[PDB]
Amino acid sequence: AQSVDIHKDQIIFSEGDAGDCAYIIEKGRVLIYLTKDKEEIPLTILGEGEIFGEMALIDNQNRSASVRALEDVRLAIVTKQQVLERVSTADKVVQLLMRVLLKRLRRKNIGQSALDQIKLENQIFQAFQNKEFELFYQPIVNLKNKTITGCEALLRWNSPQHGLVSPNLFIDIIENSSMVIPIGHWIINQALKDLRTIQDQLRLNKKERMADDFMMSINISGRQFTHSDFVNNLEDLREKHDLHTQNIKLEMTERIMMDGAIAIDALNQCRSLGYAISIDDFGTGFSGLQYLTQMPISFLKIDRSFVMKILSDPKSKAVVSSIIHLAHAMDIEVIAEGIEHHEEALVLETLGARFGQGYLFSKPVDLGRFLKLIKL
Amino acid sequence: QSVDIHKDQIIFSEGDAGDCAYIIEKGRVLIYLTKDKEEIPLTILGEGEIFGEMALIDNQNRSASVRALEDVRLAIVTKQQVLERVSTADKVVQLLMRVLLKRLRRKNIGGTQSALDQIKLENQIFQAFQNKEFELFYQPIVNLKNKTITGCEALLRWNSPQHGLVSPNLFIDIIENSSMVIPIGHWIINQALKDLRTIQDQLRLNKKERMADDFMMSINISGRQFTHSDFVNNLEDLREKHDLHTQNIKLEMTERIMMDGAIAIDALNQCRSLGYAISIDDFGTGFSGLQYLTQMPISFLKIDRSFVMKILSDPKSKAVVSSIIHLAHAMDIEVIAEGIEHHEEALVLETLGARFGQGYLFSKPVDLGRFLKLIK
Ligand SMILES: Nc1nc2c(ncn2[C@@H]2O[C@@H]3COP(=O)(O)O[C@H]4[C@@H](O)[C@H](n5cnc6c(=O)[nH]c(N)nc65)O[C@@H]4COP(=O)(O)O[C@H]3[C@H]2O)c(=O)[nH]1
Ligand SMILES: Nc1nc2c(ncn2[C@@H]2O[C@@H]3COP(=O)(O)O[C@H]4[C@@H](O)[C@H](n5cnc6c(=O)[nH]c(N)nc65)O[C@@H]4COP(=O)(O)O[C@H]3[C@H]2O)c(=O)[nH]1
Ligand SMILES: Nc1ncnc2c1ncn2[C@@H]1O[C@@H]2COP(=O)(O)O[C@H]2[C@H]1O
Ligand SMILES: Nc1ncnc2c1ncn2[C@@H]1O[C@@H]2COP(=O)(O)O[C@H]2[C@H]1O
Ligand SMILES: [Ca+2]
Ligand SMILES: [Ca+2]
Ligand SMILES: [Ca+2]
Ligand SMILES: [Ca+2]
């Protein structure tokens, strides 16, 4: 059953028959018609390239019309199994759109959790608009001397409904929605604003070197990065706040590498302009081993998930050792994440990790408390 | 946040621009056209049903007017939201939408080709399977020190009567992401196990008992066929059917299998408890494996072709290979280097610590007959 030839005047199937399979026309033409009492009623003619017999398969109902070959035709068979396989695995509302169209095309030619997702997106975007969002900052520290060298910017939603939704999942929603670009724009702006403030205070207390080497880490999502005008907008924002590129560090996940072409150059643009590129959640998600060989990275983060089990089992300790040494060999530098105890800080230090981040040192805090932290 | 509209209120009129769609929560509405003075009722829509969607998808005007027949409450659905969901839908599913839309419009008033080609190709492939056009070739895996054959990888081949001996990349993806995995996968495992028994029998009959006892048959098991239930059950009867020991059978997955997690982890442990060797193929290419080495009981891990072919070319990918090999040893995992074409690369991999090898240098994959000759 590949393609099949049928001759002129042959009824392929009749209306009211059971729906076995669909057909795509390769050669010739066919007629779609209804019959009422004695009169036959032509709905349309279908020439090559067009498809028919599909309706019956999707919703498991009978043939809504008859079909007859107006000339010699050649048809390519499409199976019931094939269409169901594709519709069943489709988006939830997309499947509704299909059912209404089917039912309307039939009815006329004769004559919650999906909704909840929509409502939640609106709740989040409305929350954004009423100024319920805020950035906190977590110190990144030099493990040797315990000195603060920078900070990661982290988003916060000040509402009791955030706990009802999920700590992570409101970011997932944001990231997969197209409210990414206006919110992302606000984040970058806010972080850059507070960076200027952090630097200004440091200089006014005769800490010129610490101010010159300070890093502001910003978490940039996949959609907002691969969007055009990203570097353009990012640059006028840096200009607006009078900042240098070496103090701004962009933090992506590995997943950004699966795209390829559209990403490569944007990484290289940021790299040529002087922005530091950091890879977060490394070894968790999309594999970058061979993509770390060719692309230009500055830092790479050993994720919480590894660090918390570093003393627990020796398997994940081996992996951390490996990551750290590999990073050095690649000329990449490392920030260990999720350090909660002095013991794990020591191990990471003897393994060769230079920089640290975790509750041991400091949980993320507001700008006020952060400015106080950098006076000791 | 839904909106109430009173009786007789026109929501929108035909010919208006398409802002957004609506889902009816309470009440009923009428869909109608107007000609000159007379209005023509297409249908009535009650609660649960959706309207105003057509205009948004293909960016055309309102195809009909809508008026509330009673007090109704409507839930708003945005333009952005529908486009976001349809654009990210399956390729043929999007065709099915366009034909239905066009037919519902064209009759109410009265990326195409490569989508169809996918359907035709699946049928071509499955039909080819059914007329016995598939065959397994085997590629020697060799001990790098002594150059002795220690096992083989089973690789699928399509020897079409018109296309000829075509190679698996053009049709394995299709097979793997289709309902035809389970019957074809079953045939592969059976065929490989059948020919394993043969390989062992011939070895013993030539007084090579030790080589027969240590022989490995590598089988490439896809993600869908692994995560399917009855996998270990079917695998086990098949081993019993051919009178084979588990230590001679090695299952070869890609990293992707563990994006699932729970459903996989135990099936790995079942195979591991039963005595099957688990090998990870295409490591560092696809879904990140670093954290997968912490969780899984792995026996072997393959350094992919992609690394090996550039191992002399640039020193960056040589560092990565060194790292992988040492990490593997530290995890108590053993290594098979893949895609060795020159003696020089074989030497480097040997000094780096890789024990086993696979590549054209030694032998390309061949039929069972030629393989049985190779092992003398
Ligand atoms: N248990 C433990 N956790 C520690 C410790 N130290 C830091 N953490 C947590 O580690 C997370 C930062 O890592 P991430 O991979 O950027 O993980 C972030 C990041 O993926 C995303 N995110 C946060 N802010 C932004 C943002 O502004 N833009 C985007 N696109 N994503 C953001 O949300 C994720 C979670 O953010 P948070 O809940 O703030 O969680 C933070 C922080 O609270 C520790 O010592 N112990
Ligand atoms: N150029 C070059 N190539 C070398 C060399 N040494 C080995 N190869 C190639 O490496 C491929 C096997 O690696 P794979 O990652 O399992 O790659 C396989 C595997 O992912 C998939 N595949 C093949 N057979 C099966 C199967 O029976 N079941 C499943 N699930 N997948 C299969 O198809 C992929 C390609 O298979 P093949 O075309 O047979 O290609 C083979 C083999 O021809 C070399 O020295 N030079
Ligand atoms: N109004 C129409 N205009 C064009 N084709 C139609 C129309 N109605 C039905 N068809 C096609 O005719 C086929 C009859 O069999 P099905 O109902 O399975 O699938 C139907 C559609 O593919
Ligand atoms: N024939 C029909 N049967 C039921 N609803 C229809 C029909 N034609 C159009 N509609 C609906 O009326 C809406 C008018 O605006 P749209 O064309 O955007 O989307 C249209 C459909 O949602
Ligand atoms: Ca981060
Ligand atoms: Ca992280
Ligand atoms: Ca393989
Ligand atoms: Ca491989």
Can you summarize this structure?
The first copy, chain A, has helices spanning 55-58, 80-88, 92-110, 113-129, 161-165, 169-175, 180-204, 208-212, 222-226, 230-240, 261-273, 291-294, 304-307, 314-329, 342-351, 367-373, and strands at 3-6, 11-13, 21-27, 30-36, 39-46, 51-52, 66-69, 73-79, 133-142, 147-157, 215-219, 248-253, 276-280, 286-287, 299-302, 333-337, 355-357. Chain A has 376 residues and is an alpha/beta fold.
Describe the structure.
The structure is a homodimer of 376-residue chains. Chain A has helices at 55-58, 80-88, 92-110, 113-129, 161-165, 169-175, 180-204, 208-212, 222-226, 230-240, 261-273, 291-294, 304-307, 314-329, 342-351, 367-373; strands spanning 3-6, 11-13, 21-27, 30-36, 39-46, 51-52, 66-69, 73-79, 133-142, 147-157, 215-219, 248-253, 276-280, 286-287, 299-302, 333-337, 355-357. Chain A has 376 residues and is an alpha/beta fold. In chain A, helix 7 packs parallel to helix 10. In chain A, the strands form three sheets. An eight-stranded mixed beta barrel of chain A has the order 9-10-11-12-13-15-16-17. Chain A has a four-stranded antiparallel β-sheet with strand order 1-8-3-6. In chain A, strands 2-7-4-5 form a four-stranded antiparallel β-sheet, with no helix packed on it. Helices cover 43% and strands 25% of the residues of chain A. The first copy, chain A, folds into two domains: 1-88, no CATH class; 116-376, EAL domain (TIM Barrel), CATH 3.20.20.450. Chain A is elongated. The interface between A and B is large, with 72 and 69 residues. Strand 14 (286-287) of chain A pairs antiparallel with strand 15 of chain B, so a sheet runs across the interface. The complex binds ligand C2E (2 copies), adenosine-3',5'-cyclic-monophosphate (2 copies) and calcium ion (4 copies). Residues 154-156, 167-169, 172, 188, 220, 222, 281-282, 305, 338-341, 358-360, 365 of chain B line the site of one ligand C2E. Chain A: This is Signal transduction protein.
